[PDB]
């Protein structure tokens, strides 16, 4: 749940 958030935030930061 939190891990999901982390992964996604790593990917969204890229932009």
């Amino acid at each position: 749940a939190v891990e999901r958030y982390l992964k996604d935030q790593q990917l969204l930061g890229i932009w």
Partner: nanobody
Framework: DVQLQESGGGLVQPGGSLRLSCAAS????????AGWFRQAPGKQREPVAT???????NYADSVKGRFTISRDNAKNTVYLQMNSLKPEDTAVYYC??????????????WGQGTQVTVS
């Protein structure tokens, strides 16, 4: 530990099509989200595409309409469908998989890259 491995690259004619795959050697770890980068001959590494854990997808402006990112969850593989290539797409393509669990610890992982040429 794990080693991401890109494949499906290679030579292709202008107007052609390719499908890149990215996976962990031996399927020992799942990939729930990932993204594709590319590096042109004399340019800066840039993001190309992204897919989150939820399924949400984002692309660079120079590839929207042409590329499609996706994943086969049963084989922990992520794909990049590349259509209507043009010489601007000539580059080395890298695979990025964040926060992968292995041997007691999370870590980000990169592939060694794959050549794509449009002549």
């Amino acid at each position: 530990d794990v080693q991401l491995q890109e494949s499906g690259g290679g030579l292709v004619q202008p107007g052609g099509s390719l499908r890149l795959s990215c996976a962990a050697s031996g399927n020992i770890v799942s990939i729930d989200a990932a993204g594709w980068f590319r590096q042109a001959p004399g340019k800066q590494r840039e993001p190309v595409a992204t897919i989150l854990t939820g399924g949400a997808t984002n692309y660079a402006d120079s590839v929207k309409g042409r590329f499609t990112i996706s994943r086969d969850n049963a084989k922990n593989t992520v794909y990049l469908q590349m259509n209507s290539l043009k010489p601007e797409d000539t580059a080395v393509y890298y695979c990025y998989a964040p926060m992968i669990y292995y041997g007691g610890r999370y870590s980000d992982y990169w592939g060694q890259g794959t050549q794509v040429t449009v002549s």
